[PDB]
A paper describes a structure:
The hydrolysis of ATP by the F-ATPase isolated from mitochondria is inhibited by a small basic protein, known as IF1. The binding of IF1 to the enzyme requires the hydrolysis of ATP to drive the anticlockwise rotation of the central stalk (as viewed from the membrane domain of the intact enzyme) and entrap the inhibitor in its binding site. The ATPase inhibitor protein from Saccharomyces cerevisiae is 63 amino acids long. The poorly conserved N-terminal region (residues 1–16), is followed by a well-conserved segment from residues 17 to 45, corresponding to the long α-helix in the inhibitory region of the bovine protein.
The models of both assemblies in the asymmetric unit contain the same residues and have the same nucleotide occupancy. Residues 17–35 of the α-helix are bound into a deep groove between the C-terminal domains of the αDP- and βDP-subunits. Residues 1–5 of the inhibitor are in the aqueous chamber surrounding the γ-subunit in the central region of the F1-domain. Residues 6–16 form a loop region held together by a salt bridge between residues R9 and D15 of the inhibitor, and by a hydrogen-bonding network involving residues S4, R9 and D15 of the inhibitor. However, the other interactions noted in the bovine complex are not conserved, but the structure indicates that there are additional significant interactions that are specific to the yeast complex. They are a salt bridge between residue E2 of the inhibitor with residue K361 in α-helix H of the αE-subunit, and between R32 of the inhibitor and E398 and E405 in the βDP-subunit, and an electrostatic interaction between inhibitor residue D15 and R9 in the γ-subunit. In the bovine structure, there is no nucleotide bound to this subunit, whereas in the yeast complex, the still partially formed nucleotide binding site of the βE-subunit is occupied by ADP, but without an accompanying bound magnesium ion, despite the presence of 13 mM magnesium sulphate during formation and crystallization of the inhibited complex. However, the amino acid side chains that are involved in coordinating a magnesium ion indirectly by binding ligand water molecules (βE189, βE193 and βD256) have moved away from the positions that provide the coordinating environment (as found in the βDP- and βTP-subunits), and the magnesium ion has been released from the βE-subunit. Thus, the present structure indicates that the magnesium ion is released before ADP, and that the inhibitor has arrested the catalytic cycle of ATP hydrolysis immediately preceding the release of the nucleotide.
Numbering used by the authors:
A (entry chain S): 1 to 49, 53 to 61
B (entry chain R): 11 to 23, 27 to 137
C (entry chain T): 1 to 36
D (entry chain M): 384 to 509
E (entry chain K): 256 to 509
F (entry chain Q): 1 to 59, 71 to 276
G (entry chain N), H (entry chain P): 360 to 475
The structure:
Amino acid sequence: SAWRKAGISYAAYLNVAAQAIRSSLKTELQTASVLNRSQTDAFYTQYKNASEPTPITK
Amino acid sequence: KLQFALPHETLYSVTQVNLPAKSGRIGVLANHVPTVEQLLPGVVEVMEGSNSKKFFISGGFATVQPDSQLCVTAIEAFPLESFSQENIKNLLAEAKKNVSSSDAREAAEAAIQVEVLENLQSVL
Amino acid sequence: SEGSTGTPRGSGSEDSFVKRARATEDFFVRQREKEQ
Amino acid sequence: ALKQVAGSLKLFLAQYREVAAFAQFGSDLDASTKQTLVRGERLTQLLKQNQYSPLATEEQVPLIYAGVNGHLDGIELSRIGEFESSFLSYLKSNHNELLTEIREKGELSKELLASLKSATESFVAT
Amino acid sequence: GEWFRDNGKHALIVYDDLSKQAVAYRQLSLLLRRPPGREAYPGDVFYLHSRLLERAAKLSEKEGSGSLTALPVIETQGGDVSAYIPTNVISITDGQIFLEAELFYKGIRPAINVGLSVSRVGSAAQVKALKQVAGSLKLFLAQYREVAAFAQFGSDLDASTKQTLVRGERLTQLLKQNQYSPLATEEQVPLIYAGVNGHLDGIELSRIGEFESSFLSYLKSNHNELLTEIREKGELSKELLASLKSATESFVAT
Amino acid sequence: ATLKEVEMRLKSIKNIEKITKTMKIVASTRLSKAEKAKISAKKMDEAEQLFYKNAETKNKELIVAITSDKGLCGSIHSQLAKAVRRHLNDQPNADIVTIGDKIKMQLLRTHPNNIKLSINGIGKDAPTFQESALIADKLLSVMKAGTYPKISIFYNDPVSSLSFEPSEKPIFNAKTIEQSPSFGKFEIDTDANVPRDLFEYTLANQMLTAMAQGYAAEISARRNAMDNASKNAGDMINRYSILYNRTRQAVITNELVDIITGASS
Amino acid sequence: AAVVGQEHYDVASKVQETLQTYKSLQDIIAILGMDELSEQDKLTVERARKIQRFLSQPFAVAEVFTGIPGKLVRLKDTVASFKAVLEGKYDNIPEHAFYMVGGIEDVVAKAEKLAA
Amino acid sequence: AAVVGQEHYDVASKVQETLQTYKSLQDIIAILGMDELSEQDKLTVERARKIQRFLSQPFAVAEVFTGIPGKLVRLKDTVASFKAVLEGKYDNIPEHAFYMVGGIEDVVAKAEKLAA
C-alpha cells in the first residue's frame, strides 16, 4: 500500500496486519494471551525544558 | 536447518521452505545463495521431506545465512485451519468502509487491512 | 481485621501505611474526577 | 475582620495537609494541586511566630489576607519571615489609615477589602 | 430445666447471658466485703460458671436417659476472646459458636466464623445424612479460607485455585440464612449436596439466593418421596445418593 | 504503649504479612509465565541480530531507558537510573526517552532538561510487539529516531532467576547498516528500501527484547522484595506479640492494685 | 424488612456491604497500591467514597460551624437517593457533589454549580 | 535565638527536623526497604544517619570502654560542623567516618584514613 504518504512506519504497518490476522482467528482459538497481544493502555507525553504538552495514546 | 521464530513462540529452531518475499514469491533449497529481503504478509509453507505444514504469517524479514541457515522472523504466524471465514468478512467490510473514512491515517490504516484480509481469503 | 492496615482511624493513631493508603488513593480519585 | 480574611484557612490547612502525603507518594502531578501545595507551605511559615511578640489584629488581618489569596505563592519560603516585618513597616509608613480602619471598625467593608487588595498587589513588587 | 432431664425427657437451656450474671455475682461479693480478685470478681468466679454448666448432661440408660443441653451466652468486649470471663466459660463448655461483626457487615448471617467455631463432641450427634455431605463441606471450606486472599488477583489464578474459590464463594453464600427461618434436616441435605459435589459452580453468585427457594419447592412438588425417606431414615442409601444426583442434575438445566 | 495501641499495631502488621506473602506467590506465578516469553524474545534476538554479527556493524544521541510505572520491586528503577547517569557523564547533551514513570521519576530529578518524551502505562501487562512497534513509530515520527548517529536502549537484564544487572545495547540507523564492513555479502535490492526497513524493524524487536527482559527482572525483584517485606513483618509481629503480653500482664496487675488499695481502706 | 419494607432493608444492607468491602480494599491499597485492584474494585472504592460523603449533612444548629444552612431530608428521599447511587445512576458525578448536602436533587445542583 | 544566636538556633532546628523526618519513616524502612522511599527522602535518611553518628562522641572517662581517646568539642565548632553537614558539603563522605569522633576535621581525617 501507500503508508509512505501517511505517517506509517514499517513495524506499525506489520502490527496493523498482525492485528487483523489475530482478529481473523477462529473465535475459540482467540485465547486469553492472544487477546492480550492486541490491547495496551500505554500513553505518550512529549517534554520540553521539565513541563510538557497534552497526554496522548497508543 | 531453519530458525522460525515469533515474539511469543519459536516454531522450529528440515529440507525446504517457501516464503512470500517483497520480491518474487521464492522457494528455498538446501544450498541457497545468502539473501536478505523483506516478507510481505503471505503464506509460509515448509516441507520436511515429504509432509508439509502451512503457516500464514503477518510479515517480517527473511534471512539466509552463509552456513546454510534460514532465519524467518514474523510477528504472527498461524495454520489456515485456525481461521473462521466470517470473522475475516466482518473485518474486511469494516476495513473497506474505513478506507476514505475521514482525514488521518485512520483512512490509510484501513487500506492496509483490506489488502491483507484479501490476501487471506484468496487462500483456502 | 478488615481495614486494620488501610482505613483512617484517629489522627494520633496513624501508621505510615494508613498515611500512604490515603495518599495513593486520593491521587487516584483526583485523576479520575479530572478526566470526567 | 479576621473571620473575613481567614475564610477557609483551617480547612485550607486540611486541603494542604492532604497534599502533604502526595509528595512522599513520589508523584509529580496535579499542577492545580501544585497551587494549593505551595500555598500551604507558605501559610505554615506565616503562622510561625517568635515568643513574646504578639500582634495586634490590624497587623494580623493584612498578613492572613496576603497568604490566603495566594499573594505569597511567588515568594521564597526563607524570606516570609522578613516579608512580614517589612510589609507592616510599609503599611505603617504609607497606608496608616488602612490599619486605623481595621482597628476601630473591627470589620472590612467592600471598600476596604479592595483598598487592602490594592496595597497588597502593590507591595509584592518590593 | 433439670426436671425434664431427670424424668427421661430432654430440655434446652439458654443463659442469656453469663457476662451479666458474673457482674451481678461481683456486685454481691464486693458489697458483702468478700475479698476481690482479678477485675474485682470474687476468687471463685470460675466456680460460679463451672458449677452451673456441669449440670447440663446426657444421662445413662440406668438413670432414665434424660438430657439437659446448655447454650450459655457470653458477650465479648472488643472481640477479645482472651478476656477474663469469656476465657473461663470457653474452657468450661464443649465448644463454641463464635460471631463476628465483620462477617455480619459483609452479609454473612448468621455471622459465624467457621474457623474459630467448634463442637468437640462433633459428628457423634449429627444426623447421618448431614454427616455424609458435611464431612467434605468442612474440607472445601477449610481449603477456601486458606486461599481466600488470592481472590484479589483473579487475573493470575491457576486451575485448582480458581476452582477452590468458585466452590468456596458458593458454599459461603449457601450458609447465609434469613432470621426466624430454620430449615428441616431433609431441606438442608440437598442444598448441601448441590454445593459440595459441584452443581452450583456454574451459577452466578447473586443467584444462589433465588436458587435455594426454587430448588426446594420443586423438590416438595416432584421428589417429596426422597425428602420423606431422608427425614424418616436419617441415613442415605446408595440408591438415594443416585436418586438425589438425578433430581439435582435435572434442576441444573434451568 | 497502651494495650489497645499494641493491638491495633499488631492487627495492622498481621495483614501486611498476609498481603505481602500473597503478592510474592502471585509474582512467582507471573515469573513462570514471563520466563517463557523471555526465552522466545531471546530467540528472536539470536536470529534477528545474526545479520549484525556477520555484517559486523559499528557506529547528539538518543537514549531510551526502560523500566515501568510500578514500585515495590527493589532498586530496579534507581539502579538503572544510575547506569544512565553514568553514560550521561560521558555524553551530557543526549536526548532521553523514558518508558515508565518510575525511571522518568529518577532522571527528571538529576537531568530534567534532557528528557524529551515519556511513555506511560507499560508495566502492568506483559510487553507486546504492538507496544514496541507503536513506541518505535512515535520514536521515528516525533523524535526523528532515524537522524541519530548513536541509539542506546537501557534495560535490566535478568542474569539469574534471583538477581539482575542494568545492561545496555545499541541500535544502528539505516545510514549505519549500509556502511557495515560485510554488508554486501548478501544479495540485496538497492532499488527497494531494505536499510530503512531493517533499522525500523530491529528498533521494534530490540525494544521488545529489552522490555521482555526488564519485565522478568522486575517481577523477580518484586518477588524478592515481597519475600523480605513478609519476613520482616513476621519479626515485627513477634516483637509486638511479646510487647502485647508484657502490657497485658501489667494491666491486670495495675488494675488489681487499684482495687486492693481501695479495699484496704 | 417487616418494619421499613424489603426495599429499605436491601438498600441499607448493600450500602453497609459496600462500606465493609471498601475497608478490605483500603488494606490492599496501603501495601500494593492501585495496580492490583480489579475494575469493579476501583468502582466499589469510588462509590463507597461517594456514599461516605453522601452520609454527611449540614445541621441547622451546626450553622455557626459550617457556614452552610442546614438541611432536613425526608426518609423516602434518603432511601430513593441511596438506591439510585447503589444502582449506578451517578457514577459520572464527582465526590464533592455528595458532600455536605441534602437529598439527591441537591447533589445534581451542586454538581452543575462546580462545573461552572 | 536570644541566647544562642539565630545561627545556632537554626542549625539545631534543622538537625531536629532531619532526625524527626527519619524517625517518621522507620515503619516503611523496616517493612518495605529503603528502595520504597522518594529520592528526597532517601537523602534525608542518609543525612540523618550521619547526623546520628556525628552526635556520638568519645568520652575521656570512657577511654577504657572505647580504647578511643576522649574528645572535647567546642560549642562554636559543633555549630559550624553541623551547619556544614546540613548544607550538603559532606554527602560524599561515608557514614562510619562521622562515628565516634570530635569536630568535622576529624570526620575528614577519618574519611581519608578509611580511603587508604
